[PDB]
C-alpha cells in the first residue's frame, strides 16, 4: 500500500513540474517573438534616421 | 538589454525543470528486481537546498 501511494505522489510531482515547464516554454517563445518584433521596430526607426539626411 | 536578461533567467529555470523531470521519471521507473537496487549512506538527510513548496 505505501509503495502504491508513493506511485501516486511521484506521478503528481511529475505532472506539477511538467506543467511548470510547459508554461515556461510558452513564456520563452513569447519573449523570442517579442524580441524579434522590437528589434525589427528599432531597425525601422534607425533606417528612418537615414531619411533625415537627404 | 533588459529582455535578454529576462530570457536568460527563464532559460536557466527551464533547463533545471527539464532535467529535474528527467531524473524524476528515472526515479519513478525504478522498482524491485533492478540492478541499481542497493543500500545507501544517509538517504533520509535534509539537503543543502531544502527549497519547500
Amino acid at each position: 500500500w505505501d509503495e502504491h501511494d508513493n506511485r501516486t505522489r511521484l506521478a503528481e510531482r511529475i505532472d506539477t513540474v511538467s506543467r511548470w515547464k510547459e508554461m515556461l516554454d510558452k513564456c520563452l517563445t513569447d519573449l523570442d517573438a517579442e524580441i524579434d518584433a522590437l528589434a525589427q521596430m528599432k531597425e525601422s526607426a534607425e533606417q528612418n534616421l537615414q531619411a533625415k539626411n537627404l | 538589454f533588459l529582455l535578454q536578461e529576462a530570457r536568460q533567467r527563464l532559460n536557466s529555470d527551464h533547463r533545471g525543470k527539464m532535467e529535474t523531470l528527467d531524473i524524476d521519471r528515472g526515479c519513478l521507473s525504478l522498482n524491485l528486481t533492478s540492478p541499481n537496487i542497493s543500500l545507501k549512506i544517509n538517504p533520509t538527510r535534509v539537503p543543502n537546498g531544502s527549497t519547500s513548496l
Partner: peptide
Amino acid sequence: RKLQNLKLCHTRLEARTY
C-alpha cells in the same frame, strides 16, 4: 523480501539528491 523493499526505498531517496 523486506530488505529488498528497504533497498528500493533507499535508492529512491538517494536518486532525488542529484
